[PDB]
């Protein structure tokens, strides 16, 4: 009944290309992380996984149409507040409904709930997490929709620290359009998908909040914070 | 012609035991460091080697008779300024005159000058380093003398940041005694050894100074400092 506009389509080519450039389905770079071990035994390996991911999320972000033109401060503000959410969204790519875990190799790079516990996190986080991963996986998103959801999550103007919350609101809306249009046109059987997707964003906030609290506690214990990486400390730190 | 006193001897048992407790001749813990790779390719692995060593040097220090009774500030001040020197001294244990390198396994955990270069250091440091390692190895120190030299180096009152530089001067002298006495009594053929040993301390300062400058440069480049560890950043940082 319709068809995406040239502009919208070029945006999709950019996000998809950006993701391919910042996400390897082989997970070959994991051999460079401190090896996993199953007190907080998995902390070193997971800290490295997360850190590596932030580096990847930043690369993606820099390629989101519009982002580069924001003030470094807002880029930072947005990255800092959404980082963890973007990592949870992209992680879905490795999540397996089969064994309810992230399989990036295995048995060495297969991450179960138990493992994340050995990194200092509880079921109060992991419970909703896997639940979110499952529900999200069931949506069978087209790569195009997966990349949009990520770009949309990052440009949420409702982030603590954001300045020009009006230009951010605009860009997120432009992307929300392309996503809505795309599902209507390219997604057979997807009429309530959009709704289901925006809802996922809301579930992300709860996961984020929980993670932040659990992170703060871990963060204050020097014997544990010393296992983290400088970038993780910077991105998740309370630093103004 | 003499014989160590009971007190001096108990000190030697403490330093030797302390070293055994904080130094593994199997280097089995290295598999937990980020794997080496031969821009600054070895930086991640070596940062982890150094970091691990600081943790070990701290353990040793805490067992040096007298140290625990200093002010946390002086303990820190002493650790911060001597850390790198203690690591160079203890590294001798793994240095091989054969291949002029530190062999803690291999070929994976064998460190040549080239490798340290891939971690951001130059021959301006590595040149005197190996030279120092060689000369030091040639001294064939008894374990007892090796542990004393380390305890003596750590209690050098001439460190920037030191407060009670008089109690530190005292303790270092007490240890210098036990070392002198020991060589006279237990070291056949060692008459100029003591002199050769105190001289090594002086060579350490040059290596330290050089390392500090080279470290400072690496430290200011965020793309490199992000490869370091929180403890390394803390110990070698300019933080007052």
């Amino acid at each position: 009944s319709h068809m995406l506009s040239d502009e919208q389509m070029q945006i999709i080519n950019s996000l998809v290309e950006a993701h391919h450039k910042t996400y390897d389905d082989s997970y070959s770079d994991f051999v460079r992380f401190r090896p996993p071990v199953r007190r907080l035994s998995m902390l070193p390996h997971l800290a490295d996984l997360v850190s590596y991911s932030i580096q990847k999320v930043i690369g993606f972000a820099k390629m989101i149409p519009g982002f580069r033109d924001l003030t470094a401060e807002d880029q930072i503000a947005l990255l800092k507040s959404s980082a963890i959410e973007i990592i949870m969204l992209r992680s879905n790519q490795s999540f397996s409904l089969e064994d309810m875990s992230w399989s990036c190799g295995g048995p060495d790079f297969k991450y179960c709930i138990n493992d994340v516990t050995k990194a200092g996190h509880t079921l109060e986080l992991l419970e909703p997490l896997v639940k979110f991963q499952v529900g999200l996986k069931k949506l069978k998103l087209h790569e195009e929709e997966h990349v949009l959801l990520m770009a949309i999550c990052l440009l949420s103007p409702d982030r603590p620290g954001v300045q020009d919350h009006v230009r951010i609101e605009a860009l997120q809306d432009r992307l929300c359009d392309v996503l809505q249009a795309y599902i209507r046109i390219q997604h057979p059987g997807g009429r309530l998908l959009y709704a289901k997707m925006i809802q996922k964003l809301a579930d992300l906030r709860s996961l984020n909040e929980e993670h932040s609290k659990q992170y703060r506690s871990l963060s204050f214990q020097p014997e544990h914070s010393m296992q983290l990486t400088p970038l993780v400390l910077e991105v998740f730190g309370s630093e103004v | 012609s003499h014989m160590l006193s009971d007190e001096q001897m108990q000190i030697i048992n403490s330093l030797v035991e302390a070293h055994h407790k904080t130094y593994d001749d199997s280097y089995s813990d290295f598999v937990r460091f980020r794997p080496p790779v031969r821009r600054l390719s070895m930086l991640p692995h070596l940062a982890d080697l150094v970091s691990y060593s600081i943790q070990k040097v701290i353990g040793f220090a805490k067992m040096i008779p007298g140290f625990r009774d200093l002010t946390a500030e002086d303990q820190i001040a002493l650790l911060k300024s001597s850390a790198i020197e203690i690591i160079m001294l203890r590294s001798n244990q793994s240095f091989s005159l054969e291949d002029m390198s530190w062999s803690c396994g291999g070929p994976d955990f064998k460190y040549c000058i080239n490798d340290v270069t891939k971690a951001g250091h130059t021959l301006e440091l590595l040149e005197p380093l190996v030279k120092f390692q060689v000369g030091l190895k040639k001294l064939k120190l008894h374990e007892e003398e090796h542990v004393l030299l380390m305890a003596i180096c750590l209690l050098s009152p001439d460190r920037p940041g030191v407060q009670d530089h008089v109690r530190i001067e005292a303790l270092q002298d007490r240890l210098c005694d036990v070392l002198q006495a020991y060589i006279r009594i237990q070291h056949p053929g060692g008459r100029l050894l003591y002199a050769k040993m105190i001289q090594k301390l002086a060579d350490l300062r040059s290596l330290n100074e050089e390392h500090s400058k080279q470290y400072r440069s690496l430290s200011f480049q965020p793309e490199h400092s992000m490869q370091l560890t929180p403890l390394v950043l803390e110990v070698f940082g300019s933080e007052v």
């Binding site: 580069r68 930072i76 800092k80 970038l231 630093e239 | 965020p222 400092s225």
Partner: peptide, 11 residues
């Protein structure tokens, strides 16, 4: 200060 972040967001 976010030195690392500023550096990575730089191209």
């Amino acid at each position: 200060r976010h030195k690392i972040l500023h550096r990575l967001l730089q191209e």
